[PDB]
Design a protein around this ligand. Structure first.
Ligand SMILES: [Zn+2]
Lengths: 92, 148
DNA sequence: TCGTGCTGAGTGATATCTGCTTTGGGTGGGTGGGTGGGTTGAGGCAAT
DNA sequence: GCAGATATCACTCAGCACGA
């Protein structure tokens, strides 16, 4: 009767998602030599889990990562953009 | 957004029409006219009436819930349910637009810190010895008291 | 070296279904009602 | 009319082999 919510390229490419990550990802995340490795890993996973929950509350963190892997493998439009970001850096 | 009754913090009560006012302006007062538990029949249901009698039982003040507040552990959204009967069925799944667009099966959990309560008392009123007809026993009428 | 159409498999939501009493007992009542029923006997203690 | 326990059917997804 109702199509299942699914992590499509459209949601990822929306303002919330990859654009949000590129906007503010280095400022919030911070790996410090003084702090232990566990704390830095916790901080990184803390940022990414919050972003995923804001974007895709449906799936847990590990499931979100696996779905992201599959989508990146499949979707061509996602590949287009992923190549594009790298291309801009080569330009820079 | 939220039900209107939730924000209300006042209680509205009606004062009957005194006999002096009714006679002053050429009218008959039905509400103020005292009655007895015997005369309160089914025809008076849904009206404002006065009853004269002696209280024979009172209960301890208890909180009667009027608006229940729930919290979704996923959305962060609160769901308010009005209760206007002697019994109600608690909500289980979130109905927020967030749980709808994402179709997440978030669970609602009751939170008594945000609900609305009103003091409740149940009493009994009985007829005086001057109102019981010969050969009849006194009757009792339940009274519900809410608010202040 | 690899991309995609076909398939079995397994949940999700939804269809029918049974059930909607239940129960012996006074901190479940009598505005829930008797076509839902409850039928002791000895022993201890206050009053005198 | 109402809540709960139960079983039914339909739809969609990850693997597989082949052909490009
Ligand atoms: Zn919710």
């Amino acid at each position: 009767r109702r199509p299942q919510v699914k992590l499509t390229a459209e949601k990822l490419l929306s303002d919330k998602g990859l654009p949000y990550v590129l906007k503010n990802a280095h400022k919030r995340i911070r790996i410090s030599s003084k702090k232990n490795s566990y704390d830095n890993l916790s901080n990184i996973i803390q940022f990414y889990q919050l972003w995923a929950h804001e974007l895709f509350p449906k799936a847990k963190f590990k499931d979100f990562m696996k779905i992201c892997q599959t989508v990146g493998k499949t979707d061509p439009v996602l590949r287009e953009y992923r190549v594009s970001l790298f291309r801009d850096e080569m330009g820079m | 957004l939220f039900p209107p009754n939730l924000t209300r913090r006042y209680f509205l009560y009606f004062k009957p029409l005194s006999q002096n006012c009714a006679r002053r302006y050429r009218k008959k007062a039905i509400s103020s006219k005292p009655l007895s538990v015997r005369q309160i029949k089914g025809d008076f249901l849904g009206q404002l009436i006065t009853v004269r009698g002696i209280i024979t039982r009172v209960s301890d003040v208890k909180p009667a819930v009027e608006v229940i507040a729930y919290t979704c552990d996923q959305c962060g959204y609160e769901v308010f349910q009005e209760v206007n009967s002697r019994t109600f069925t608690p909500l289980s799944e979130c109905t927020s637009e967030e749980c709808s667009q994402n179709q997440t099966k978030g669970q609602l959990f009751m939170s008594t810190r945000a609900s609305k309560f009103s003091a409740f008392q149940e009493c009994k009123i009985q007829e005086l010895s001057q109102q019981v007809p010969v050969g009849h026993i006194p009757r009792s009428l339940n009274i519900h008291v809410n608010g202040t």
